[PDB]
């Protein structure tokens, strides 16, 4: 509301609404375990430092790849998300228990971490006439995939 | 005549808390003058001390309801206005039935403050 | 119904509007707050500014015997919404009007009213981004431009706001006589016993070298002129709080008594509508006759 | 805050239009009157009501022997068709009306507005927000 003017202040609680009000967007529905997942890292603050134009392309490498497995990184024994059937058991068992939190955590502090130190750092690099475009039509394409 | 003339200087007093949290808003309660700072003081305290926990909720809520009598409500607002029960703490109003239950609530808030204070110097 | 919506509009748009205003509240009131400071650290720079300057002096032999250019430097906000400052300075300049005034107001307002009101008088003004706290190089920069206006000049006249309260900004008034006519009186105040309190510091400044008076003269210029601005612009910030409660009050008025008039037009619209459709309905009840009743009525 | 003469009358007569239960047309009168000709300039607005009660429900002068009007008594209820008939501004009534008005405006500001205004303590202030309360609502 003070926000029309006078430049607003990037607190926390505006770091985190602003990625919220984009995860919102989106095409078609999310499977349960995919949102929920979404909601939970963006809920900590792991998008924090993730600029609010490439929240769709995180959430989308998130979802469909797995960063720590690309570069040999990941240790987590059985929660990845490419296993969908993961699901049910987040449901019987909430995003806060010690059977699925710790794991949860490592996961996305390892795909944030890969995320910043590989991709964002190459979308704040590009200077170019054809780079600009294509990155604003893979933007635009994960807007509407996630 | 007592019950209305308490009604009265309770809706004044909470239409003056009104007034008084805007001028604080541009100035900041300590610019304010200390009648003005004693009125900011027992408004909050009645704003707590209208509250109450009721006993059907004694259930899902966990809290012992009370059922406040008209003439209790009366003195316990009548004293408050005045200024006798400057020294409670603002929270032993908070969801409480009655003056008696805001002396006990004191009591036990000084209690455990004590205790803490105790078990923090031996370590 | 298209007239019911002209009202929702219509109330649409106020509702925007009191945001909006609200929003500037807020940034003045950040300002003030942060400007609210001076308050404490003020009234204390100039106290030797005072003997070389306070000279409470008639208002007509001081602008009547006029031989030289009189300049003036008012004091005026960028931007609008401040109240009745900048009016109360013109009105302040209009009564000071004569032949040999010269213009170099502040502040945008201050050039629009005054390049339309006196285009040939004025000369130019200055500008200042409400960017930066309010420093001596921007005082200097204020004096400097005067004295190219008008190096002959009689007597630069500052006019600005002092914020007495929250609530009260009169309009004050620097003096500042040029250097001829200062070190006449400084040199008069000094061997006679005339304006004794000036004494000791006008002998104290004629032992000294000229080089340095004139240093004295301009720094002290500067300082009149960087108070000023300063109280100002605290003025500024406070009377636009005062201001902009006003623009949210008249706004609110004119939200209850556009709502009235649409939910009072959608309770007519009703109304209206109904009634039109229980006319057509009896107009063909009316219409309409009941033949004979072909029945055995003697079977009865 | 400029306070005029006609500023200080119109919230003494706003206060006095403050009412409860019809009043007797001789004590109206009489107190637009006493309001009107600036008697209770003096008086503080929110001690109007307990000043007007006086005048009505009391007597001031024969409490402190300081009276010696011969008819104009406000005890006299017979008094308001005489008023009624002549005038307040009648030199019959005229005399005797400003007399006994300024002596109960004295009596008044001297012992009852005085001691108002050294009341400080929280009891006391109790006690006269109460009485204000009482007389707000009766005369
Ligand atoms: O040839 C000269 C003579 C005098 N002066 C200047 O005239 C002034 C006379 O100054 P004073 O006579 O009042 O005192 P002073 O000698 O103790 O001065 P300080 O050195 O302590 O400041 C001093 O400021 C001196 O420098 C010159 O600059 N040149």
Not at chain 3, 157 to 164: A, D, G, H
Not at chain 3, 183 to 200: G, I, V
Not at chain 3, 203 to 214: G, K, P, S, Y
């Amino acid at each position: 509301a003070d926000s029309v003017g006078g430049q607003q202040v990037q607190t926390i609680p505006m770091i985190r609404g602003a990625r919220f009000v984009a995860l919102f967007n989106q095409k078609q529905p999310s499977y349960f375990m995919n949102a929920i997942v979404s909601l939970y890292a963006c809920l900590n603050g792991y998008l924090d430092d993730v600029k609010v134009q490439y929240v769709k392309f995180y959430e989308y490498l998130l979802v469909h790849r797995d960063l720590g497995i690309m570069y040999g990184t990941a240790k987590n024994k059985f929660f990845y998300m490419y296993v969908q059937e993961l699901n049910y058991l987040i449901r019987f068992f909430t995003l806060n228990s010690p059977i699925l939190h710790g794991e949860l955590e490592e996961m996305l502090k390892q795909h944030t971490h890969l995320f910043l130190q590989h991709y964002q750092s190459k979308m704040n690099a590009i200077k170019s006439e054809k780079d600009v475009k294509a990155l604003k039509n893979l933007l635009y394409s994960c807007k509407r995939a996630v | 005549v007592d019950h209305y003339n308490v009604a009265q200087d309770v809706v004044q007093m909470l239409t003056k808390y009104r007034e008084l949290q805007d001028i604080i808003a541009v100035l900041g309660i300590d610019e304010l003058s200390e009648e003005d700072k004693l009125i900011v003081d027992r408004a909050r305290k009645l704003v707590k001390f209208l509250s109450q926990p009721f006993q059907v909720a004694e259930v899902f809520t966990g809290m012992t309801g009370h059922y406040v009598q008209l003439d209790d409500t009366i003195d316990s607002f009548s004293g408050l206005l005045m200024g006798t029960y400057d020294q409670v703490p603002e929270m032993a109003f908070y969801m409480v039935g009655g003056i008696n239950s805001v002396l006990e609530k004191a009591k036990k808030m000084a209690e455990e403050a004590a205790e803490l204070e105790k078990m923090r110097r031996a370590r | 119904s298209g007239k019911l919506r002209l009202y929702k509009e219509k109330l649409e748009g106020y509702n925007r509007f009191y945001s909006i205003v609200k929003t500037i509240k807020m940034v003045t009131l950040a300002k003030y707050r942060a400007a609210q400071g001076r308050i404490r650290t003020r009234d204390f720079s100039l106290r030797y500014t005072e003997l070389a300057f306070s000279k409470p002096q008639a208002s007509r032999d001081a602008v009547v015997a006029a031989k030289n250019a009189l300049v003036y430097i008012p004091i005026t906000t960028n931007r609008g919404s401040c109240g009745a400052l900048n009016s109360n300075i013109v009105r302040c300049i209009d009564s000071v009007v004569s032949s040999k005034m010269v213009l170099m107001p502040v502040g945008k307002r201050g050039i629009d009213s005054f390049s339309k009101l006196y285009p040939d008088e004025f000369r130019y003004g200055i500008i200042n981004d409400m960017k930066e706290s309010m420093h001596f190089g921007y005082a200097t920069f204020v004096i400097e431009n005067a004295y190219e206006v008008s190096k002959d000049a009689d007597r630069y006249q500052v006019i600005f706001n002092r914020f007495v309260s929250a609530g009260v900004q009169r309009n004050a008034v620097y003096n500042i006589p040029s250097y001829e006519k200062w070190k006449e009186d400084l040199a008069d105040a000094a061997s006679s016993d005339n304006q004794k309190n000036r004494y000791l510091f006008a002998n104290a400044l004629q032992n000294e070298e000229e080089q340095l008076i004139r240093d004295f003269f301009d720094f002290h210029a500067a300082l009149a002129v960087l108070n000023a601005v300063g109280e100002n612009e605290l003025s500024e910030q406070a009377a636009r709080l005062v201001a902009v409660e006003g623009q949210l009050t008249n706004i609110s008025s004119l939200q209850q008594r556009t709502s009235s008039l649409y939910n009072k037009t959608r309770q007519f619209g009703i109304t209206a509508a109904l009634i039109e459709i229980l006319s057509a309905m009896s107009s063909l009840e009316g219409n309409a006759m009941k033949g004979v009743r072909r029945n055995k009525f003697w079977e009865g």
